[PDB]
Design an enzyme around this catalytic site. Structure first.
Site, PDB file in Angstrom:
ATOM      1  CB  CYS A 186      -0.940   0.003   1.209  1.00 37.00           C
ATOM      2  SG  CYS A 186      -1.903  -1.542   1.423  1.00 37.00           S
ATOM      3  CB  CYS A 228      -2.181   1.231   7.378  1.00 33.10           C
ATOM      4  SG  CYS A 228      -3.640   0.715   6.477  1.00 33.10           S
ATOM      5  N   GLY A 272       0.587  -3.254   4.554  1.00 31.35           N
ATOM      6  CA  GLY A 272       0.500  -4.672   4.870  1.00 31.35           C
ATOM      7  C   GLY A 272       1.861  -5.235   5.197  1.00 31.35           C
ATOM      8  CG  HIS A 327      -6.439   0.264  -1.186  1.00 28.50           C
ATOM      9  ND1 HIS A 327      -5.626   1.356  -0.963  1.00 28.50           N
ATOM     10  CD2 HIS A 327      -5.829  -0.785  -0.582  1.00 28.50           C
ATOM     11  CE1 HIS A 327      -4.563   0.980  -0.274  1.00 28.50           C
ATOM     12  NE2 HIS A 327      -4.662  -0.313  -0.029  1.00 28.50           N
TER      13      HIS A 327
END
Ligand SMILES: CC(C)(C)C(=O)OCC(C)(C)[C@@H](O)C(=O)NCCC(=O)NCCS
Ligand SMILES: CC(C)(C)C(=O)OCC(C)(C)[C@@H](O)C(=O)NCCC(=O)NCCS
Lengths: 389, 389, 389, 389
Positions: free
Chosen positions: A86, A375, A377, A345
């Protein structure tokens, strides 16, 4: 020192929607051409294209190089892709900043791109399957959305944050609806027009211009949010309503020095004052923005209250509320034009995506100081502090 | 300014050989652990792990982050992957250099890792195949070895350099045997012992320590080199003998400031004095090292003659001769311990692979100045200049 | 009324052994050719070829037709395949008989063929896999070896018979060994030579004549039967030792009327006095032969004790023991030359495979009355009574 | 001697249409249930189920058996499938007729079924694909539609007939249009209602009763026929318009002796007076019906002109016109309610499909003598002569 002279992004398409059959690099080249045109900079002046991408499997050698070339960036320049999940799209910009700050490049097109629709199903068949069934693995779910360590989907880490921060189902849904309503508002009002560069989907029986984010739900109610069953933990709290979606898109910025933009008569979207990447437990990966934003703010010399606008990536309503609750910034300046729940996303492009939304709003409402954060992963966070000139 | 305090690498294993079923990130973790142990630095102190990788398909969320965690690098640190094809592994070290130079980290474990054996077969099957035959694609060939623009294998780009530089079949074979012979001599003499860290292949009916490069042929004759038919152009000059192989492996360095290495009582392997990455025509991709080393040498203020040792990555014998012929450095100091034809070519790790050989030979024979360089698919070249302290 | 004028079969090959890459219909044609040669009948005279086959997927339109054509059987004739699982080879012959018995044909080639080695892996992909892993299924296990109702392997049915008839591990192993030993003796003595027709495996670097059944183990010990762990129920009694194998082969008989044999000067292998097929519970499908054999005997007017030789297929030792025990015929005259545990189990050919062994032993030892019978998956059995002229 | 007491067939559904996800054995059970129901015969009394199916790959052990069991037919009865391509479904009835005529059965449910929709893609991957791309084969095209000998689609065989019999593009279209129009009229008038038994498609968000053939086009124009391009030979004459389709369905009939029906008080749909199957050149496989119908009529003792209704399957307009032209029967009694161009072609069911339409129109209009026949891939025909009592 280092500025974003210009920016752009594609509309964010839904899973197998507008860009179902559109390779990531084609989205990237459109955004590379766009930032070049918007800054008044020729592709012949670009030294390097850095594009975050998480799911390049089956698209061939280095999609970053493919995007650059199709964008008319010359063969003398360089290009490459990177993966911090991300966080990639925003880190690409920071990595692009570093190129210029260390004297290794003058002009850098950075950002990210992702085609989650075009991620293939795969399987290791070199050893030969003598007998028995075997799995064809979804690279998207394996390489993009499932934690390598504890083996569960990112939505399970959202449950860990929801239970740890005791965030109820009702609180997560209200945030979800608020994201959808803001994002419809900013859409109708044309507030996505500046940042979005139209993408021509090359068809056979007709081309299609996509310049509207098609994942944004219109007139999203609280009733339809409360009826969905939990998507991951079958007696849990996170759903398809309050989580982010699977999406395709790209986004980029054109970086150069503050002296170089001044030479060229360009007035930049902003100045990159500081950035920061920090780690956390992969079990509560949604808490990434907390230490990373705080690290960035420390490098920038700023307090949390100095920020005029913030783009905190909505991976899940559980983790988006937790970040907001911990840092304690004014929620009215956070995701003012909605967030990833409504907009989508596109993993690799998500960071460059939220950088556009931040830069153009900062320009539109006259914000001085701004911050982006996602955030990540595997349990990390990345942040970047921008100031306008 | 910035130094490689320590380094390490796995033996390079053949295709479906010693590491046939060993995922990249496991190879990477051993190298991380090795560089930490060899410097006398705890995993706790590591701020980030930057790993070049080209074929991560199927291996799960961010293999750099998996490598780091299993290596004992804590959750607070960061980790990411990047792809600039062959040049990924060396560009990790320059990017890792940039982190430290810009004041965003104190210690960095950079390099590359590749499992070509574990590269899956794939196909995009979301739309459904209503009717007809489809192709299961080989992500190794597609994403690793086939040019994205002209569609052919890298060996055809080696044919374009051979015909342009008029390098005969006999010249390439001679260079091919010389690499094998040099590499067997260095192997028998134990010159690869320092850089190689043993890797325990976790089995079921017995583990296996791999600390020897199993792709190095022993007693390579010119006759078996001249009998092979052309691998790519059926009336051409490049063969499986004079081309590099498909290989697994990992390689890394531990980077910190020159003052920090002095604080810790660490005598570094060398000081990174410059680097550079440049582009060329993708048709003649093998020529990448020519402008890229020239740039690197210009940034270091050095002339080509000043170099005491050089590692020029042997992707093909056609391109390896071309770079040596253009740049004109003394061929007796180039790939002294052999090269990729004999050792192997683990795409993502290869740039970190050749760095290790350079560094440990520079230390062993007392070479002051050295240079590493690789040709990159898609038409680019990277180079780094290392001076010892 | 109807007689088997001639018969033949290939050596039965091991899973991915002799015939690993040999399509079923090539084996079928060799055997078709053979029964023509052995009877003194020209392919021109053949009215129809009927071939049991269970796993034809990927071999193309109607392998039976392909068999016949390659045998030189003329286009004016007809050919087809049929599937009644393990029974298919022997039922074809009974179906062949019926063609002649009703005046619809004069000369029929009937039997079966199977390449379990060339059974492909498959998957239904027309709808599309939008997201998530999918299974490539093993058609051999899915369509040949798993019960469609209860969803387990045929070995678990074998366990149901083991427990219902309270057949010990020790009893099954001894039987398993007695099959291997009888089979090796009959091999060494040459008793398989009459029935087998050599098959030429068309190679590239050399053709290979296969005319010994390769799955027959030599010098089989009770101790190596006792040490194997159970293949299906991990606290069970059936194993890879006491079960049949996965194998390749074909077999066929040439049928015509008794009057027609006499016109041609043919001395037939036997006169088909009756056949039967009957059904039983699929859990205990190994018990197929019990009511089938009984039925066939009743149609023949024979008692069990009137039989001089029996071939009762050994799918598993547990069921094989059960059939013997229930019916109560003298075990010294059953599978006198060994059976499927030793010889192999090429599903669709198996019924013609055992007919061959019955027929050629009957001629060799001067047995007047004989019976052939196989248990069938999904809970069925087939039996056929043969008498010699 | 032997009669058809009752018959039934499902709606024939389009490729990936109403039965896209319905395994063939579910269609076969509804039709077994139906034929039992419609005769006044209990599943208990059924001795055997014989179902032609050509593409059972991936469905499991013996769908014939699965169909039977689901239908409630008891475990004591028996069941099997056969493959003679397009002929499969009608040869099942003749093979059922043989079981009763030779005393081996009293009541037989026979016919065919096919889900071309559910045919999987397959590949043979046991040996291991060391290196390179491989093909996933479409079992439907490979095992059902392509000729095994000459390698081309059935449509190319259709061209050979078109050229040989000098049948123009215009003549083929008119025939194609006329099949559609006759089928729409019969559909609107309820002429398919007797034969069709509704099929409940089990869903999740609703069940669906399909009792209408969905492939029939309404208001088909000659114009849209003429505009289509040649589907096979690009300068040829056969198209998707004048070719049959890819379809799903089942069909069945219940056979018993004429006396047995008389005992049960049943008035049969018809007596089977003869059948035949015959071979021809695969190149012109569409000519199958010519010698097979001639053979059939000979065994019956009937001249062509005695027939009062005929069902000559429409595989292709070219072949259909050929067979009508060669045999010379009144075209107004052939395919009176339309044919396969309009209704569809579920390969294994099709021969039973056309039996039904023959049977129910013979009853409805009071035709005494009738004949069904289909052309068969690989170069064969089948024909059955029916008389009414
Ligand atoms: C690979 C090898 C040697 C065969 C082995 O070890 O496995 C044994 C196996 C596959 C568990 C066992 O199911 C097997 O070979 N079965 C064949 C018997 C079978 O299903 N016959 C059908 C007749 S009802
Ligand atoms: C159905 C669809 C996808 C529109 C289509 O393309 O149909 C035309 C198609 C597939 C090219 C054509 O080959 C076809 O439908 N053929 C079926 C006719 C056929 O060969 N039947 C077997 C009896 S010999």
């Amino acid at each position: 020192s280092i500025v974003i002279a210009s920016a752009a992004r594609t509309a964010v398409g839904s899973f197998n929607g507008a860009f179902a059959n559109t390779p990531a690099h084609e989205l990237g080249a459109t955004v590379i051409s766009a930032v070049l045109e918007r800054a008044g900079v020729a592709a012949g002046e670009v030294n390097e294209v850095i594009l975050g991408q998480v799911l390049p499997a089956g698209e061939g050698q280095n999609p970053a190089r493919q995007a650059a070339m199709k964008a008319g960036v010359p063969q003398e320049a360089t290009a490459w892709g990177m993966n911090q999940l991300c966080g990639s799209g925003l880190r690409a910009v920071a990595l692009g900043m570093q190129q210029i700050a260390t004297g290794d490049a003058s002009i850098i097109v950075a950002g990210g791109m992702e085609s989650m629709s075009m991620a293939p199903h795969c399987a290791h068949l070199r050893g030969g399957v003598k007998m028995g069934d075997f799995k064809m693995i979804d690279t998207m779910i394996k390489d993009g959305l499932t934690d390598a360590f504890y083996g569960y989907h990112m939505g399970t880490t959202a449950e860990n944050v929801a239970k740890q921060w005791q965030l109820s189902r009702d609180e997560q849904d209200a945030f979800a609806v608020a994201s959808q309503n803001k994002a419809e508002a900013a859409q109708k009002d044309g507030r996505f027009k500046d940042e979005i560069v139209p993408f021509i989907v090359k068809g056979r029986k007709g081309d299609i211009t996509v310049d509207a984010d098609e994942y944004i739900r219109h007139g999203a109610t609280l009733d339809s949010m409360a009826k969905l069953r939990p998507a991951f933990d079958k007696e849990g709290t996170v759903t398809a309503g309050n989580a982010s979606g699977l999406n395709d898109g790209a986004a980029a910025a054109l970086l150069m020095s503050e002296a170089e933009a001044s030479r060229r008569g360009i007035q930049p979207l902003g100045r990159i004052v500081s950035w920061a990447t920090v780690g956390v437990d992969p079990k509560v990966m949604g808490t990434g923005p907390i230490p990373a934003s705080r690290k960035a703010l420390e490098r920038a010399g700023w307090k949390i209250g100095d920020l005029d606008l913030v783009e905190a990536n909505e991976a899940f309503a559980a983790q988006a509320c937790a970040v907001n609750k911990d840092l304690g910034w004014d929620p009215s300046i956070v995701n003012v034009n909605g967030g990833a729940i409504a907009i989508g996303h596109p993993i690799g492009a998500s960071g460059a995506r939220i950088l556009n939304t931040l830069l153009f709003e900062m320009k539109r409402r006259g914000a001085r100081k701004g911050l982006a954060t996602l955030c990540i992963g595997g349990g990390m966070g990345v942040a970047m502090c921008i100031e306008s000139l």
